Amino acid sequence: LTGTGVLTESNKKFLPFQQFGRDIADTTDAVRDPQTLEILDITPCSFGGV
Amino acid sequence: YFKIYSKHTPINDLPQGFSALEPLVDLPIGINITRFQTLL
Ligand SMILES: *[C@@H]1O[C@H](CO)[C@@H](O)[C@H](O)[C@H]1NC(C)=O
Ligand SMILES: *[C@@H]1O[C@H](CO)[C@@H](O)[C@H](O)[C@H]1NC(C)=O
């Protein structure tokens, strides 16, 4: 899963079988880190219209 | 290519209401199943 974003700690209550989460656009919203199963939120890097 | 899901709850003949079952396993076994039975 390639991408670009701010990775954060998250409160998302992933059940023990769930590996990643999605937004309604099908874009990934969170991931469980494969080497140590912390649940990371994914947010796009800070942006806006100029 | 086989799945098992489960749930387990205390109760007050199948009880009413709602249940959502988490996967226990995917088994990569690809076995042809048409028939089944239960151990007692
Ligand atoms: C991966 O390796 C690190 C360092 O050896 C270890 O702390 C971690 O528990 C390992 N994770 C898995 C899923 O084996
Ligand atoms: C499973 O075996 C039966 C005969 O024992 C056969 O009719 C059936 O086509 C087989 N299943 C599949 C997916 O082909």
Curated annotation (Swiss-Prot), chain A:
Q: Which domain of life is it from?
A: Viruses
Q: What does this protein do?
A: Attaches the virion to the cell membrane by interacting with host receptor, initiating the infection. The major receptor is host ACE2. When S2/S2' has been cleaved, binding to the receptor triggers direct fusion at the cell membrane. When S2/S2' has not been cleaved, binding to the receptor results in internalization of the virus by endocytosis using host TFRC and GRM2 and leading to fusion of the virion membrane with the host endosomal membrane. Alternatively, may use NRP1/NRP2 and integrin as entry receptors.
**What does the subunit section of this Swiss-Prot or TrEMBL entry state?**
Binds to host ACE2. RBD also interacts with the N-linked glycan on 'Asn-90' of ACE2. Cleavage of S generates a polybasic C-terminal sequence on S1 that binds to host Neuropilin-1 (NRP1) and Neuropilin-2 (NRP2) receptors. Interacts with host integrin alpha-5/beta-1 (ITGA5:ITGB1) and with ACE2 in complex with integrin alpha-5/beta-1 (ITGA5:ITGB1). May interact via cytoplasmic c-terminus with M protein. May interact (via N-terminus) with host bilirubin and biliverdin, thereby preventing antibody binding to the SARS-CoV-2 spike NTD via an allosteric mechanism.
Q: What's the protein called, per UniProt? A: Spike protein S1
Where does this protein come from, organism-wise?
Answer: Severe acute respiratory syndrome coronavirus 2 (2019-nCoV)
Identify the gene encoding this protein. S
Q: Which residues of the full protein are shown?
A: 546 to 595 of 1273
Curated annotation (Swiss-Prot), chain B:
> What does the UniProt function comment say about this protein?
Attaches the virion to the cell membrane by interacting with host receptor, initiating the infection. The major receptor is host ACE2. When S2/S2' has been cleaved, binding to the receptor triggers direct fusion at the cell membrane. When S2/S2' has not been cleaved, binding to the receptor results in internalization of the virus by endocytosis using host TFRC and GRM2 and leading to fusion of the virion membrane with the host endosomal membrane. Alternatively, may use NRP1/NRP2 and integrin as entry receptors.
Q: List the protein's name.
A: Spike protein S1
Which part of the complete protein is shown?
200 to 242 of 1273
Please tell me, according to the UniProt entry, what happens when changing N32Q.
Increased resistance to neutralizing antibodies
The organism that produces this protein has a lineage beginning with:
Viruses, Riboviria, Orthornavirae, Pisuviricota, Pisoniviricetes
- Subunit-level organization: Binds to host ACE2. RBD also interacts with the N-linked glycan on 'Asn-90' of ACE2. Cleavage of S generates a polybasic C-terminal sequence on S1 that binds to host Neuropilin-1 (NRP1) and Neuropilin-2 (NRP2) receptors. Interacts with host integrin alpha-5/beta-1 (ITGA5:ITGB1) and with ACE2 in complex with integrin alpha-5/beta-1 (ITGA5:ITGB1). May interact via cytoplasmic c-terminus with M protein. May interact (via N-terminus) with host bilirubin and biliverdin, thereby preventing antibody binding to the SARS-CoV-2 spike NTD via an allosteric mechanism.
Q: Which residues are glycosylated?
A: N32
Q: Which organism is it from?
A: Severe acute respiratory syndrome coronavirus 2
